Design an enzyme around this catalytic site. Sequence first.
Site, PDB file in Angstrom:
ATOM      1  N   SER D 130       0.866  -1.081   0.019  1.00  0.00           N
ATOM      2  CA  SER D 130      -0.057   0.080  -0.181  1.00  0.00           C
ATOM      3  C   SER D 130       0.949   1.327   0.011  1.00  0.00           C
ATOM      4  CB  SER D 130      -0.928  -0.096   1.087  1.00  0.00           C
ATOM      5  OG  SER D 130      -0.249  -0.073   2.508  1.00  0.00           O
ATOM      6  N   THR D 135       5.310   1.584   5.951  1.00  0.00           N
ATOM      7  CA  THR D 135       5.975   0.332   5.570  1.00  0.00           C
ATOM      8  C   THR D 135       5.596  -0.021   4.108  1.00  0.00           C
ATOM      9  OG1 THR D 135       5.633  -0.372   8.026  1.00  0.00           O
ATOM     10  CG2 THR D 135       6.347  -2.032   6.263  1.00  0.00           C
ATOM     11  N   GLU D 244       5.128 -10.656 -21.804  1.00  0.00           N
ATOM     12  CA  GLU D 244       4.306  -9.889 -22.715  1.00  0.00           C
ATOM     13  C   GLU D 244       3.267  -9.051 -21.972  1.00  0.00           C
ATOM     14  OE1 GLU D 244       2.794 -12.671 -25.799  1.00  0.00           O
ATOM     15  OE2 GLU D 244       2.870 -14.446 -24.117  1.00  0.00           O
TER      16      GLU D 244
HETATM   17  N1  LIG Z   1      -7.948  -2.370  -0.046  1.00  0.00           N
HETATM   18  C1  LIG Z   1      -7.721  -2.791   1.170  1.00  0.00           C
HETATM   19  N2  LIG Z   1      -6.486  -1.666   1.696  1.00  0.00           N
HETATM   20  C2  LIG Z   1      -6.079  -2.145   2.994  1.00  0.00           C
HETATM   21  C3  LIG Z   1      -6.485  -3.235   3.654  1.00  0.00           C
HETATM   22  N3  LIG Z   1      -5.947  -3.074   5.017  1.00  0.00           N
HETATM   23  C4  LIG Z   1      -5.046  -2.139   4.938  1.00  0.00           C
HETATM   24  N4  LIG Z   1      -5.220  -1.434   3.716  1.00  0.00           N
HETATM   25  C5  LIG Z   1      -4.419  -0.255   3.173  1.00  0.00           C
HETATM   26  O1  LIG Z   1      -3.593   0.149   4.449  1.00  0.00           O
HETATM   27  C6  LIG Z   1      -3.710   1.559   4.682  1.00  0.00           C
HETATM   28  C7  LIG Z   1      -3.488   1.789   6.235  1.00  0.00           C
HETATM   29  O2  LIG Z   1      -2.072   1.911   6.623  1.00  0.00           O
HETATM   30  P1  LIG Z   1      -1.230   0.699   6.461  1.00  0.00           P
HETATM   31  O3  LIG Z   1      -0.813   0.178   5.251  1.00  0.00           O
HETATM   32  O4  LIG Z   1      -1.892  -0.802   7.324  1.00  0.00           O
HETATM   33  O5  LIG Z   1       0.024   0.862   7.350  1.00  0.00           O
HETATM   34  P2  LIG Z   1       0.774   0.158   8.508  1.00  0.00           P
HETATM   35  O6  LIG Z   1       0.539  -1.525   8.240  1.00  0.00           O
HETATM   36  O7  LIG Z   1       0.601   0.210   9.761  1.00  0.00           O
HETATM   37  O8  LIG Z   1       2.572   0.340   8.056  1.00  0.00           O
HETATM   38  P3  LIG Z   1       2.976   1.462   8.630  1.00  0.00           P
HETATM   39  O9  LIG Z   1       2.067   2.784   8.105  1.00  0.00           O
HETATM   40  O10 LIG Z   1       4.396   1.947   8.037  1.00  0.00           O
HETATM   41  O11 LIG Z   1       3.131   1.585  10.259  1.00  0.00           O
HETATM   42  C8  LIG Z   1      -5.155   2.000   4.201  1.00  0.00           C
HETATM   43  O12 LIG Z   1      -4.736   3.345   3.692  1.00  0.00           O
HETATM   44  C9  LIG Z   1      -5.471   0.986   3.232  1.00  0.00           C
HETATM   45  O13 LIG Z   1      -5.393   1.557   2.011  1.00  0.00           O
HETATM   46  C10 LIG Z   1      -7.505  -3.915   3.210  1.00  0.00           C
HETATM   47  O14 LIG Z   1      -7.905  -5.066   3.705  1.00  0.00           O
HETATM   48  N5  LIG Z   1      -7.837  -3.918   1.888  1.00  0.00           N
END
Ligand SMILES: Nc1nc2c(ncn2[C@@H]2O[C@H](COP(=O)(O)OP(=O)(O)OP(=O)(O)O)[C@@H](O)[C@H]2O)c(=O)[nH]1
Lengths: 426, 426, 422, 422
Positions: D130, D135, D244
């Site tokens: 993401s 991270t 491709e």
């Molecule tokens: N589409 C989708 N996105 C998710 C999901 N779970 C988390 N995300 C994404 O994750 C973001 C939230 O932050 P994280 O990616 O979880 O950040 P983190 O895992 O705490 O890692 P750090 O920010 O470095 O601490 C949201 O903006 C979502 O876009 C999911 O189940 N589906």
Amino acid sequence: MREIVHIQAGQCGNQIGAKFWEIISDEHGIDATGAYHGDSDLQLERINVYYNEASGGKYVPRAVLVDLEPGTMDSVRSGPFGQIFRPDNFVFGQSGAGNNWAKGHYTEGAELVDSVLDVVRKEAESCDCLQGFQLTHSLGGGTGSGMGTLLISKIREEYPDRIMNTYSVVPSPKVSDTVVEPYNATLSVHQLVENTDETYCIDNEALYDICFRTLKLTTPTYGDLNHLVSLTMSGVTTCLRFPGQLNADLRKLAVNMVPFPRLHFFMPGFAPLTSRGSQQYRALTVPELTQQMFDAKNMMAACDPRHGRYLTVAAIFRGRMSMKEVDEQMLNIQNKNSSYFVEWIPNNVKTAVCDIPPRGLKMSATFIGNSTAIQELFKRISEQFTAMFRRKAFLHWYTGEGMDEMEFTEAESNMNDLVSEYQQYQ
Amino acid sequence: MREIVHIQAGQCGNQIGAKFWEIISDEHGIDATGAYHGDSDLQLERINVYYNEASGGKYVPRAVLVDLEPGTMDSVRSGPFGQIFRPDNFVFGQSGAGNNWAKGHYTEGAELVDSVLDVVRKEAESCDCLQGFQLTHSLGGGTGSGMGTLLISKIREEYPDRIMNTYSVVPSPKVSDTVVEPYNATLSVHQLVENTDETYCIDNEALYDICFRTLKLTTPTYGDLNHLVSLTMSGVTTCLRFPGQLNADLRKLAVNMVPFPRLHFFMPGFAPLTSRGSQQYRALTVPELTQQMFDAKNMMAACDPRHGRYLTVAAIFRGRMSMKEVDEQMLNIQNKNSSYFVEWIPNNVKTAVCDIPPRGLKMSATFIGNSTAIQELFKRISEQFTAMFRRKAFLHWYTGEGMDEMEFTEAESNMNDLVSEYQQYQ
Amino acid sequence: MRECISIHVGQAGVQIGNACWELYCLEHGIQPDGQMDSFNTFFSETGAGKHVPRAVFVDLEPTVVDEVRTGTYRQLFHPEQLITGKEDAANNYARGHYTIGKEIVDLVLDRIRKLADQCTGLQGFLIFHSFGGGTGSGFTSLLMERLSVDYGKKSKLEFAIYPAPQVSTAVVEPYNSILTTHTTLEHSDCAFMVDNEAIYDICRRNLDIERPTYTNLNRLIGQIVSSITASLRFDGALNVDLTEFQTNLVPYPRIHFPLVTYAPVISAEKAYHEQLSVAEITNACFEPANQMVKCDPRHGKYMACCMLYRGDVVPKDVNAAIATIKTKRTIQFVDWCPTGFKVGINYQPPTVVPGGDLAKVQRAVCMLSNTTAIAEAWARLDHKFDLMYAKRAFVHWYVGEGMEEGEFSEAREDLAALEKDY
Amino acid sequence: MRECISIHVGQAGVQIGNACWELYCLEHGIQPDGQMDSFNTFFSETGAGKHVPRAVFVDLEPTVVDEVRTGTYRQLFHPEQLITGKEDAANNYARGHYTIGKEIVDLVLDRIRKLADQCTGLQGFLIFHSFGGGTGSGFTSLLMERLSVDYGKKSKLEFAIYPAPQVSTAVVEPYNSILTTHTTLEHSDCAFMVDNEAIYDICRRNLDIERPTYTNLNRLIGQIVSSITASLRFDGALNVDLTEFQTNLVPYPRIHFPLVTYAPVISAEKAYHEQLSVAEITNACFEPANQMVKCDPRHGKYMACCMLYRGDVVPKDVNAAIATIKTKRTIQFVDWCPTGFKVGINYQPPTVVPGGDLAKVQRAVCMLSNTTAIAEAWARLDHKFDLMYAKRAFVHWYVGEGMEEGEFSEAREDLAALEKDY
Ligand SMILES: Nc1nc2c(ncn2[C@@H]2O[C@H](COP(=O)(O)OP(=O)(O)OP(=O)(O)O)[C@@H](O)[C@H]2O)c(=O)[nH]1
Ligand SMILES: Nc1nc2c(ncn2[C@@H]2O[C@H](COP(=O)(O)OP(=O)(O)OP(=O)(O)O)[C@@H](O)[C@H]2O)c(=O)[nH]1
Ligand SMILES: Nc1nc2c(ncn2[C@@H]2O[C@H](COP(=O)(O)OP(=O)(O)OP(O)(O)=S)[C@@H](O)[C@H]2O)c(=O)[nH]1
Ligand SMILES: Nc1nc2c(ncn2[C@@H]2O[C@H](COP(=O)(O)OP(=O)(O)OP(O)(O)=S)[C@@H](O)[C@H]2O)c(=O)[nH]1
């Protein structure tokens, strides 16, 4: 994992921390003694963040109790849930600063700094990984502010990478409980601009008026204040303590709330807050909360954000709903509150949800926001300080503890620079 | 095999040795009379180190009781476990040196040296192989110090190859129980630098403060002091008495602790030490002990190692854990306590583990360390000796027993050289 | 027909010998008493359905010997091959080399000489001991020179428990280590690694045993010696002798200290999770952390590499995997040693124990080389020796055994010359 | 025979990888432990009736990894492929790129390298993360350049959760997004769309799920990756390789950001209400609202269109439907790209889950293109970055990780140049 150590200063801070601890015992299914009885694995899976591994299937809070007098000590220990704390965490003085910052920071704090540092280091080392700290004290009080300043200084010089938040209690502008409380707020803020990563400002009269009007109580008490405090408590820390579809922690909030190192004061929030004969008639839906997110009635630290401008907003939710409704509600909040919002921080709403609702409520909502409204509070404090420092009244008590004139001068200069920067942002 | 003969001098030494003997009766499954009832073969497999082969399936301690007065004699024999000792090991005087070194070493010691040498030689010859000796006495007392000096001299001239340790009790700096106790400490140390391979310094006020604060007792007594003494006892001797994955003995410790023949004073250690309402809440893990290994609170002989520098550290463990955790903990201890440690003795931690934990505790830890902190104690003793020897007060009692001036002069010169060498190491 | 002799000195040596004999007994089906022709390399045919180990158990302390003679394998071992001491050197090389070793070296020399008398096909000698132990340093060294002077050019293999850089039972370990290394250097045909901390780390991360015990270490040695001796105790496509081991890795007598590594160390539940193919197991074993040595081999150059495959391993797959190992740049070799590869294939699968950490597998490989990273450990030990001897500490203990400091110093410079010879 | 490697970073990446492995396990009949040759593209044959995913689960926070290692699929996943962090970057690209990422990138690089060692037919790499997550931005980017420098021209596919224009978990999301986009631009072979708000809207209006959960999103990703990888995991009339995919949609290295769309997303009760024919499903999928991207493609031009049919789909019907798609004027293409159509036909019907939002259907199509509407989202993100960085807010957080504002600025101009390159 991500252990957090709680330190409480002053009588108000000790009461607040205690009430927190009973609320956490509710949320995690812990009885008055320490035994676990929760009906779900979610309560006890992350119990180590606020509890330690105790023999006999028990758990004890990761708390540190500090005071200069044992009166509130005895009341807290003899009160409810007093047996869940080991006697070692209770360390107290015997003199009492008497609502004086200098006394509690230098005279009586000299023989308590060793004890508080020893206990906090024991808590840090006995745990796996200390994510951060949380402190509660009152800036109106003299000793509690001095302990807050000393502990934040020692933590900064000892753990400069581990962030924290301080839940200080700023004295109410309407009432002058202590004559020398402007000095206390002055020195506490002068140390907070310097030894604290972020701070929440909790003002008395705002919560007093909330309990009076929003809750519709004719007899507000310290118990309701501590209850709402513990709700804020749970609202901030539930993302770390409990599993969530959008997991969050104090580090996420600190990153999302601090644009400048000196700009770190925020004003917490809680909702919904309704009485028995309104809850059964009110809509238990998100719009009823979003009309409650932004209001001067359910408002926390007595300075109206409407006069100023919001910096950014953080919203944590706990319940059973979808996420897109929250996103569109935040978009509508921007659309209608654009004037009250800042134009150069687009999408300044921090959105996260904790899956597990608090005990007894299928939603709670904690409004973490920042606005330039605190500029008014700081400016009023600065002008009051100038008013009674021009007369040089009550300076003898501080100068007898090893104080000096231009020290207070750079303190007031620091608040002047802080208020000028906040106005420049506005 | 590796038999050890115990000799006790003075009332405090006799009480300490007795309490040791009941503690060994617990650890080895021996009742108040001498019968064995231990539930494991490990207790009774190496019972011959402290017991002898007694008829009727019995065992008696390998102890020698020496005093100049029968008052504590009768109390010890009539006390608990008094029937486990044969009447022959009880040899006593009838005059009493009255807390005088010269009297107990020359006047009344002349008619007791024959008896003590006869009994120690009987114990040595009746056994298979005498690994070493262990003596307990008090340097504050006059007679006990004289018996300690006489016995170490006779052992050195009789068994120069068999090492031992002396568990002497140095008088507390804060309290002057005896006016002529500086003479006692002077002469005892002058004989210890010369007739003892290694010595542990046990100071009163440190254990007093430990019982007061760490154990949280409002009524400290000699019983708790003897209990902690017996814990030190078991902690040092469990490696030899009980099987271990890292087997060790007193010879190993002596080799690991003595860098110079005159540098042989060390300060013993015990942990964990927690009360009922902290043990059920504390972490029963190694880190809780490693934060307790190095501290001025649970500290044994009243001189802070932080001011000085550690020479080397020995750590014995008894419980169920892996060894690598201990190694990494020791490495972290170096990493964080590098300033308090010596730079030119790398990996100065002596690591060994005894498999069998003591009765009632699934860990005990005995901290055997050496630091230049004892330099302060020795220097204070030397300056006190100079202070009241410049006035030539209370010299008549000693000069009436066949004393002389420059003898004390080379005694004080010997402590001066010892403290100078310790400072040079620092 | 042929035989070999195993020597066990000290607590570590006695435990190692006991574990190795446990392996050799359970692999060949020996019950604890000795009953039910390659098994004659370590056992002797006398009477009816009888075998006894060709070993001598000696220690300055009788604790480990008493423990051995109290197990269910009392009938397995002859009583007379167990030697009990009275005065343990207590981590003092001089004590066990002069004070007690000199008056008990005679019977052992003397009767291992008979062990050679009835073993006319004596391939070599196996020595198991510890540098840290005073007995396992001094007595082992002195009997090593006695072997050299009583047998001449007979092959001798040494298994030493070198104390780890941060793991040391005794603080006087540098003295014993330097003294024994300088004393037996000229006669040590081949000496290996044992790093206790590396063993613990590998057991905790590979076998995932959070609470291991010295039994894991005991078969860590047991499986290593089994993989080494499978060629002598079992036929194969290309068997390897003890002589070739020192022929390949000792072009110069100064450097004869190769490190050892096994592959794989995998539990039964994880053995379900991974089956062995040649490329993956070799490249995993060549990984520095998989080595049971706490020295990264990539710091220096590689001397030679020897593969000991056991089981159903295809030589063509061996050649292909070894080649693709060569091409990659994580592996480097000395300029004057381009072809230093010897491969020993055996058809006997590695043997398992009931209740053991290792999983029962039909194939295994033994990782055998002499990397330059050993120079790092030698330099660190020399530096520690210089630090802790600079103020001349614990020297009086060796003085009381009757020598002055000179021999300490020239042993230090001898080992420094060894270190700079790289 | 061939394999592929999937990489999961952050909470979103870990959840996405878990969902994709759930698909791959239930499609091939894998019980939670790993039992009952195209399934070898993602699982490895060792022992008896065994398979494990070829994946690495890494995150700066151990919450999601702990959640994964508490499911019933603990036996399915090897424990060693799960990596637990200690300090989450907390939506900070610099934190997870320098402070914590730099000291934990080594083991992952290192052992995905073995995952390539035993997979000699490594087709490419799959990356799930993401932008919003600190991270999932920083660590993902750094490991992306590490992949590029350790593998050269090896194909690599990225699945990124781009924060929506009005959906942002963190307000500091523009910083992480711009930084990671500028950092991995040169090495990102192909990066897709995920719009959370568009997913919610489609689920609420198409599946008519008024109260969806991130499980719907998890198979939204799962079905997309399944449709993409069906060619590699199952034969068809005209299978399509990973190479491709980047060959068709990257004539210039600057533009490699195509959007993805699935057809159809229909519940079982609505599946009773509609059976799929090629013309209707394609024209519905080409509809802008059916796209899971919150950008109307009709604003700009179309780069190329790729069809991924799976099941019993007639190629002649495919050609006729695609032609009648071409003729209509709601679809427009660039002048220099008249023939940018590639069709991949597979005979494997899409796989269903018990209790899932999707309905079990014998045929499906995957909508694959790179429209110019992505420039609108890029310009809006750049404008938000300019607004919220103009007063230099939240910069000190990245400063405390040790860099000054310059790199922020030139990343902004780099992405501006990317935006104006259209
Ligand atoms: N589409 C989708 N996105 C998710 C999901 N779970 C988390 N995300 C994404 O994750 C973001 C939230 O932050 P994280 O990616 O979880 O950040 P983190 O895992 O705490 O890692 P750090 O920010 O470095 O601490 C949201 O903006 C979502 O876009 C999911 O189940 N589906
Ligand atoms: N790897 C391994 N090493 C062991 C084991 N048991 C003992 N050791 C080694 O033995 C050392 C301890 O000293 P010992 O060799 O037992 O010394 P000792 O047997 O008492 O002989 P002296 O020192 O002469 O009295 C440790 O440093 C270990 O390296 C074991 O089971 N496995
Ligand atoms: N919300 C809340 N406020 C409290 C509570 N108790 C005290 N306060 C507030 O705190 C302020 C006084 O702070 P306090 O901590 O008592 O000063 P102090 O310096 O510690 O007082 P002392 O120990 O030197 S005597 C008062 O204005 C009071 O309104 C409480 O339980 N809840
Ligand atoms: N820890 C501990 N200390 C003791 C105990 N009994 C006495 N002491 C200490 O020992 C010191 C006196 O030593 P002591 O042995 O009684 O002198 P003495 O020379 O033998 O006395 P006397 O026989 O000539 S009358 C005192 O300072 C006292 O505190 C005891 O049971 N435990």
